[PDB]
Amino acid sequence: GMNIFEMLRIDQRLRLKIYKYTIGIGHLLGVITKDEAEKLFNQDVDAAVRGILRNAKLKPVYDSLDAVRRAALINMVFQMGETGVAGFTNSLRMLQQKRWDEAAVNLAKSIWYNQTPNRAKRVITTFRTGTWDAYAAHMGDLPGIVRLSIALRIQPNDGPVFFKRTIKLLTGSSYKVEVKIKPTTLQVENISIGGVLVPLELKCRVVYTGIYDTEGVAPTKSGERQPIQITMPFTDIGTFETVWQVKFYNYHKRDHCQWGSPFSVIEYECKPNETRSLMWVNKESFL
């Protein structure tokens, strides 16, 4: 009995305070309650279906679709409005004609996909298959988002780190690590960086610090890069894990870690889940 309401609860974060303007479960436009957000959400789903049915470009497609694929169309209209979705002229035709694979391929070429690829890929799987397969692993998503940032500075002079995205690191060195987490109540004890354990201590988003030691790390073979696993368990909400692509340089080639594109921080948007082996890592931004 999965349905559009639960689908949108997975795809659209809930906010009780205005944010860019927007509030509730993606209600476009200063503090509302949970029940009032839920009523607004139900009204907004209603408005999306009413907009489909009034629109001469969307109603015939909607009518022709099964209940599951109808939810995918409502999801798009909820996200971007009736007029925007009615602009998907070719894909709509493909859906009406039961050309599920062509529609799915065409929808993924859109700027919509590029702007919100995780949500778009789920919506597209729903159109393609007429099943809720793409939402199965999101059963149990926690309602909130986790934001965390990781920054490195080379000691002793708080020096910058550069990419070229391949991060350029120096062996035989010490880096100050800063991890900033929202919400501030979340707790971590350690981050592992390529198998190097970095104990983290809270100071003062909430800010954790440690020191990442690269003494004894082998330099990367010339013209090659390498992944390093990044792992940070949280106390209750699961484990953050990702890969960085890095090149390690020795003392003689240290000039390579003095030039390039700097990154002050990498920002991650994550979504915890009750039972998934790892939190969802939805966005990574080098800044």
UniProtKB/Swiss-Prot annotation:
One of its GO terms (molecular function) is type 1 cannabinoid receptor binding. GO terms for cellular component: cytoplasm; GABA-ergic synapse; glutamatergic synapse; plasma membrane; presynapse. It comes from the Eukaryota. InterPro entries: CNRIP1. Belongs to the CNRIP family. PANTHER family: CB1 CANNABINOID RECEPTOR-INTERACTING PROTEIN 1 (PTHR31952:SF1). This is CB1 cannabinoid receptor-interacting protein 1. It comes from Rattus norvegicus (Rat). The lineage of its organism: Eukaryota, Metazoa, Chordata, Craniata, Vertebrata.
